[PDB]
A paper describes a structure:
[name] is a quinone detoxifying flavoenzyme that catalyzes the two-electron reduction of quinones to hydroquinones. [name] exists as a homodimer with two tightly-associated flavin adenine dinucleotide (FAD) cofactors that reside at the deepest point of each active site of two monomers of 274 residues. The normal biological function of [name] is to protect cells from the mutagenic, cytotoxic, and carcinogenic effects of natural and synthetic quinones.
The crystal structure of the hNQO1-FAD-[name] complex was determined to a resolution of 2.9 Å with excellent stereochemistry as 93 % of the residues reside in the most favored region of Ramachandran plot. The asymmetric unit of this P212121 crystal form contains seven physiological dimers. The overall structure shows interpretable electron density for most of the polypeptide chain and five bound [name] molecules. [name] binds in the active site at the same site as the nicotinamide ring of NADH as observed in a previous study. [name] binds with its halogenated naphthoquinone ring (Ring A) stacking against the isoalloxazine ring of FAD with the remainder of the compound interacting with the residues from both subunits of the dimer. Most of the interactions of brominated ring of [name] with FAD are hydrophobic except for a hydrogen bond between O19 of [name] and hydrogen attached to N10 of the central ring of the isoalloxazine moiety and a weak electrostatic interaction of 3.5 Å between O41 of [name] and O3′ of FAD. The brominated ring of [name] sits in a hydrophobic pocket lined by Trp105, Phe106, Phe178′, Tyr126′ and Tyr128′. Of these residues, Tyr128′ participates in a hydrogen bond with O20 of [name] while Tyr126′engages in a weak electrostatic interaction (3.5 Å) with O19 of [name].
Author numbering:
A (entry chain A), B (entry chain B): 3 to 272
Write the structure that this text describes.
Amino acid sequence: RRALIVLAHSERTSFNYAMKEAAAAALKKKGWEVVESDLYAMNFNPIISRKDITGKLKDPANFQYPAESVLAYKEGHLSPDIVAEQKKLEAADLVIFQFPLQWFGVPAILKGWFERVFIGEFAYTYAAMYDKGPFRSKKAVLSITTGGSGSMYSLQGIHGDMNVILWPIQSGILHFCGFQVLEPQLTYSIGHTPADARIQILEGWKKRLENIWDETPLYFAPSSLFDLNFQAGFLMKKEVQDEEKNKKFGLSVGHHLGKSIPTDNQIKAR
Amino acid sequence: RRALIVLAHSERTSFNYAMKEAAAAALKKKGWEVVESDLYAMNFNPIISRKDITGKLKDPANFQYPAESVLAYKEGHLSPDIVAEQKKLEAADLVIFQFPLQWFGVPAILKGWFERVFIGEFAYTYAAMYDKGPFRSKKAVLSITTGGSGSMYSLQGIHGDMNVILWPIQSGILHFCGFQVLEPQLTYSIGHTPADARIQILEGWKKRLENIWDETPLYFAPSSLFDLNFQAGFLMKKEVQDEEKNKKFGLSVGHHLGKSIPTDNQIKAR
Ligand SMILES: Cc1cc2nc3c(=O)[nH]c(=O)nc-3n(C[C@H](O)[C@H](O)[C@H](O)COP(=O)(O)OP(=O)(O)OC[C@H]3O[C@@H](n4cnc5c(N)ncnc54)[C@H](O)[C@@H]3O)c2cc1C
Ligand SMILES: Cc1cc2nc3c(=O)[nH]c(=O)nc-3n(C[C@H](O)[C@H](O)[C@H](O)COP(=O)(O)OP(=O)(O)OC[C@H]3O[C@@H](n4cnc5c(N)ncnc54)[C@H](O)[C@@H]3O)c2cc1C
Ligand SMILES: O=C1c2ccccc2C(=O)[C@@H](Br)[C@H]1[C@H]1C(=O)c2ccccc2C(=O)[C@@H]1O
């Protein structure tokens, strides 16, 4: 029912802004309740600081952000801007991340949003890691625009596999917190695209969003395959290790196991 | 003879600050000229904006950061803070990036530093990308500290291969600009390390820096293996494609070619 669009672009004149508006309008049309987070427009502070904890710190002499931020969440003393974003996430069923690819990742303003908003207990638990994480009932999507062509990001392109680039965001940030990660919306070489083709990209994104919730998510190795505790080193179960010995391919981009990475692990489902 | 230490930590009480001081002292002792970039202390602005261009914009109606930033570099009207950092880089032979791992990547403040400082024509060109790029005569190192243990980042750990996490920074940011990327200094689960062991870590980092310049850099596929033109799609040369058909392993993490990733591609040189 509810969706949150997080946008990491400065210009209203950009294709990224167009893609945000396309999504918002498409979803609203299909009966969704759409909430935005235009990070630049919000003049969002992306830097984690002691200013994110409203009152007195627990140990001001040796400030440690994870410890202090959790305490601030639990005691209700987080910075109001963080709290507002946290309330937006709690509410949302679908979370869309609309951004241009910058230095083979998320723009610094989005990275800062994750660091400041995805606080301990709220977003993650060392116990409730990955598929067990807080956002297990939510679904996330990355809608990316790149300057480089798709062939550059193919297995034989100079930049190398796009699946490798996506892994730290999709597994490390999103899946880590519980999210079911849906296929990314990859819009390559947008600067080279003529006007009519751009108008089509938008129509395609809108038609996708008509049934985005019914889609099958990307594959990540289930937490059930690992002995989750410090004594075991959070390693794959010895039984799973044995079962996988006779298997031709790895499980995911990170769990490639020095075997082949299953084709488009981070780009495609099934 | 010149070195630059870029530090992405708020607290002087941190092990990251200790590691910065350790490096600075070690290098200075071995006759190096050491310059710092304590991003938090500098109160560095990590957000790319039109405020990064002091002169008249080319198209203020449709602002495009890459195009305008290059023009500002060439015409000499980039933001003085950006210029100061650019002058530091121009001077440095060795560049050390001291930071805690945050959300499987660089902290937002460092990410913003790359986005705002690594401007087109200064840090890279279309022709001068990867080996045979502007910083080809420089060497870069990542000194990372993590909360999670090394086993979590092993091929069998929950987070998966650390080599996959490193790839977008080491290849995508550093090697893309010509830097020879040296073996990363990975300091795992630093919070759990006892005092005597923490001392040993610092002493080891200092002893490494005694002969850091003479080290062999990490392997990245040379640009000479690819037909770097639009007609060809920036793909590997037909002869390279064929030669690498009978080879068990891929070239790198990103150039895995659907085969096995060579062990510790992004961690070791062998
Ligand atoms: C610091 C930095 C780092 C970067 N790193 C990378 C990298 O690692 N990899 C990479 O591949 N690229 C990289 N890039 C390039 C970047 O990914 C692209 O420039 C970006 O994705 C372009 O998208 P945009 O929203 O800015 O579009 P724009 O360039 O602003 O817009 C594209 C076109 O769409 C048009 N448009 C706008 N609205 C609409 C609409 N409603 N309907 C139709 N057309 C519309 C515009 O008028 C324009 O002609 C980097 C750029 C920067 C600034
Ligand atoms: C937003 C955020 C995201 C994170 N994401 C991740 C993630 O993706 N993966 C991950 O693994 N971790 C993650 N972490 C954890 C983070 O990487 C670590 O907590 C961090 O690396 C700890 O290093 P530190 O510099 O902060 O040292 P500290 O927190 O200060 O601890 C180091 C210890 O060494 C002591 N010490 C200080 N100076 C010296 C000295 N001179 N000699 C000896 N000992 C000294 C200190 O007193 C302390 O006991 C995240 C943390 C944050 C804040
Ligand atoms: O910003 C860019 C970049 C920066 C770092 C790594 C890869 C990249 C890219 O993919 C290239 Br295409 C580059 C941009 C780029 O340099 C550029 C310069 C002048 C006009 C337009 C552009 C772009 O739209 C490009 O996106």
